[PDB]
Amino acid sequence: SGFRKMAFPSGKVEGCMVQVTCGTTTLNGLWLDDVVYCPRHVICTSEDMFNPNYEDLLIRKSNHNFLVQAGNVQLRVIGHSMQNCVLKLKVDTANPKTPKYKFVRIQPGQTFSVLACYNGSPSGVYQCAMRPNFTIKGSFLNGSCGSVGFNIDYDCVSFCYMHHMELPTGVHAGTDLEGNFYGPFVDRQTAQAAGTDTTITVNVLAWLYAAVINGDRWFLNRFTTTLNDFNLVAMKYNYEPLTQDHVDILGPLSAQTGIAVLDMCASLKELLQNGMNGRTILGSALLEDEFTPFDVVRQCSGVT
Amino acid sequence: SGFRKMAFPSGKVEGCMVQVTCGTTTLNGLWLDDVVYCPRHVICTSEDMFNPNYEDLLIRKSNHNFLVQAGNVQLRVIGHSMQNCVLKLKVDTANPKTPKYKFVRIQPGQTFSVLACYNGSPSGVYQCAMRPNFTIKGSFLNGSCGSVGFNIDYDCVSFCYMHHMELPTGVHAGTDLEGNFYGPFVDRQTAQAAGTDTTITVNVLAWLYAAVINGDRWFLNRFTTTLNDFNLVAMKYNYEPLTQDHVDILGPLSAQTGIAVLDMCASLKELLQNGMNGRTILGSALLEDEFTPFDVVRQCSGVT
Numbered sequence: 001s002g003f004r005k006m007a008f009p010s011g012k013v014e015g016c017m018v019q020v021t022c023g024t025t026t027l028n029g030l031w032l033d034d035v036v037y038c039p040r041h042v043i044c045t046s047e048d049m050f051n052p053n054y055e056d057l058l059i060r061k062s063n064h065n066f067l068v069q070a071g072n073v074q075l076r077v078i079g080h081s082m083q084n085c086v087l088k089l090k091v092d093t094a095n096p097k098t099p100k101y102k103f104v105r106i107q108p109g110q111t112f113s114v115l116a117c118y119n120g121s122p123s124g125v126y127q128c129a130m131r132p133n134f135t136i137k138g139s140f141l142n143g144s145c146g147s148v149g150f151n152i153d154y155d156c157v158s159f160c161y162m163h164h165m166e167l168p169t170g171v172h173a174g175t176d177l178e179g180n181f182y183g184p185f186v187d188r189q190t191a192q193a194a195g196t197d198t199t200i201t202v203n204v205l206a207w208l209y210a211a212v213i214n215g216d217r218w219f220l221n222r223f224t225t226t227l228n229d230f231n232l233v234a235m236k237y238n239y240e241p242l243t244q245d246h247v248d249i250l251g252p253l254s255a256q257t258g259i260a261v262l263d264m265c266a267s268l269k270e271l272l273q274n275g276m277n278g279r280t281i282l283g284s285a286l287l288e289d290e291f292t293p294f295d296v297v298r299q300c301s302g303v304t
Numbered sequence: 305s306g307f308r309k310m311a312f313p314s315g316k317v318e319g320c321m322v323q324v325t326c327g328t329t330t331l332n333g334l335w336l337d338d339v340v341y342c343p344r345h346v347i348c349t350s351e352d353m354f355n356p357n358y359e360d361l362l363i364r365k366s367n368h369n370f371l372v373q374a375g376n377v378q379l380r381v382i383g384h385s386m387q388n389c390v391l392k393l394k395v396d397t398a399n400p401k402t403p404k405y406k407f408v409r410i411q412p413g414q415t416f417s418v419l420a421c422y423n424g425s426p427s428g429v430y431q432c433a434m435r436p437n438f439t440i441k442g443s444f445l446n447g448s449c450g451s452v453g454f455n456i457d458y459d460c461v462s463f464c465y466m467h468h469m470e471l472p473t474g475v476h477a478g479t480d481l482e483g484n485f486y487g488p489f490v491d492r493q494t495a496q497a498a499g500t501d502t503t504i505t506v507n508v509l510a511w512l513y514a515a516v517i518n519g520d521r522w523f524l525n526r527f528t529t530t531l532n533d534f535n536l537v538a539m540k541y542n543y544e545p546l547t548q549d550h551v552d553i554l555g556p557l558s559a560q561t562g563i564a565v566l567d568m569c570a571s572l573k574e575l576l577q578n579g580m581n582g583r584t585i586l587g588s589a590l591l592e593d594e595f596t597p598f599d600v601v602r603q604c605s606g607v608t
């Protein structure tokens with residue numbers, strides 16, 4: 001037993017991380033086949049980053065201006081292109097460690113693993129949710145851009161996130177591997193708002209189910225509710241409205257625990273209205289919303 | 305900015321995980337050079353596990369009774385020995401992916417990364433502290449034994465933990481890579497007590513420093529204290545007594561923030577006595593003690 005925020009093993013992605021330097025700016029790139037993907041603001045000086053004209057900046061750059069290093073070994077850049085907010089650098093060597101991979105645009109409420117990197121070298125790994133307001137709550141310093149987020153399904157790495165920036169609220173923003181930002185964000189150093197950070201209701205319920213699967217049951221009560229009545233309380237607390245598809249997704253955890261989803265909803269309602277009275281759930285004193293139902297099943301079933 | 309529980313990249317350890325089956329029992333092994341390390345209870349049937357006589361059970365086993373698989377590829381076992389609570393299986397092939405490595409016995413209060421595995425295949429990665437009562441709070445199912453915990457310093461993997469069992473309280477217990485349990489535990493299915501779970505004071509302070517490094521400062525007050533007076537309150541709350549060596553270890557975070565350690569101690573005292581009044585620190589509503597000072601510096605400096 002036990003329940004922990006758990007990242008995927010990072011080995012397959014470690015072998016894809018390179019360093020990309022353009023002038024004075026160094027960040028990370030993702031090397032897959034003969035292409036290196038990185039954030040386009042690698043072509044910016046610090047001054048340029050407040051209002052870059054990326055097309056104009058990029059025109060002053062040639063292949064030899066992009067220094068790409070895989071470990072100690074320099075890669076030869078033979079072409080470059082800009083796709084939305086990422087650069088694709090073509091190199092003369094296919095990465096021999098390229099895993100089976102896909103690029104995917106994840107949906108809000110889904111989770112993924114971040115391999116935080118500096119100077120092309122991995123620093124650590126942790127799980128994030130793409131929040132409903134299309135930000136993530138990560139750990140990123142100067143030099144971390146180009147770090148990527150991913151999921152693994154057996155053998156295949158689905159890359160879904162590349163890191164670009166931090167918002168004034170301390171949350172983090174980035175793109176899919178085609179260079180399209182999640183959310184309304186642009187890669188320039190202006191003040192930008194993410195909007196209300198609503199809570200992923202279905203994930204909170206999944207984590208309450210995880211708590212019961214793992215022995216924590218004090219919050220279970222004698223009440224039930226309805227979707228519409230629950231949601232009247234979801235709105236007040238800036239929770240996402242719960243839908244029958246959410247109910248179905250919780251099916252396996254509901255079946256597996258014998259607790260009807262709407263009964264658990266009634267437990268959640270009481271926790272929202274009355275707090276946790278100094279108690280804890282799976283070692284937390286807050287309602288946790290960054291575990292998907294799949295994450296709960298995956299962990300409690302030992303999926304590898 | 306941002307602060308997250310962060311595991312080391314697992315790639316170097318992934319390449320060392322194998323499957324070890326003895327009869328009906330399958331668990332994980334660690335393959336380094338021509339030796340596979342695994343928990344000795346792989347030789348037990350389910351019945352044997354309540355009161356095994358390991359020496360007697362092991363005498364009925366020969367090399368060919370240990371099936372060791374690296375991915376799809378069978379390894380040939382050419383010798384076996386029992387060292388404390390682990391088996392060393394000698395195989396005829398040196399692991400070509402063996403990293404630079406050390407075996408270390410970590411001290412209580414230090415952290416490490418767990419690569420949870422099933423059937424010799426990695427499932428996920430997460431950070432644990434060796435708690436003062438020599439348990440860890442992990443996520444482990446049937447089949448997870450032989451999963452290992454480790455630290456990396458640049459190129460060298462220091463293995464410090466191998467997983468063996470779960471206590472009735474839902475916490476986890478295991479050995480160093482020489483097979484010696486952390487704590488008073490034995491590998492048999494009896495009820496076993498870990499004792500009072502005291503809190504790692506120096507780590508809580510480090511995490512309060514991390515909170516300030518990352519913008520959370522509401523808990524800073526106008527008070528200071530002394531070591532002896534602080535500890536009078538540490539005892540009541542089952543915190544470890546704070547020592548001057550702890551104070552020195554916090555030196556870099558104290559210097560880096562301009563907050564005297566004893567001033568921060570006064571903040572912690574008030575948080576213990578008055579709770580957090582519904583507020584949060586680095587996204588938590590509890591005082592977090594599983595980050596070492598080193599962990600805080602490492603993360604906030606981008607060590608790779």
Ligand SMILES: *[C@H](O)[C@H](C[C@@H]1CCNC1=O)NC(=O)[C@H](CC(C)C)NC(=O)OCc1ccccc1
Pocket residue numbers: 027041044049140141142143144145146163164165166167172186187188189305
């Ligand atoms: C890429 O390495 C970097 C990551 C930032 C730096 C601190 N934490 C992060 O997530 N991105 C930028 O520096 C980004 C570049 C623009 C062209 C979008 N600018 C940015 O995030 O500005 C806000 C900021 C910068 C430096 C420190 C704190 C906030």
Ligand SMILES: *[C@H](O)[C@H](C[C@@H]1CCNC1=O)NC(=O)[C@H](CC(C)C)NC(=O)OCc1ccccc1
Pocket residue numbers: 001331345348353444445446447448449450467468469470471476490491492493
């Ligand atoms: C090794 O795979 C296994 C890991 C346990 C199983 C559930 N969670 C864990 O950490 N260890 C054992 O099964 C261990 C073997 C003895 C010879 C020490 N026995 C054990 O941990 O018993 C308690 C227990 C067993 C099964 C489910 C829940 C608790």
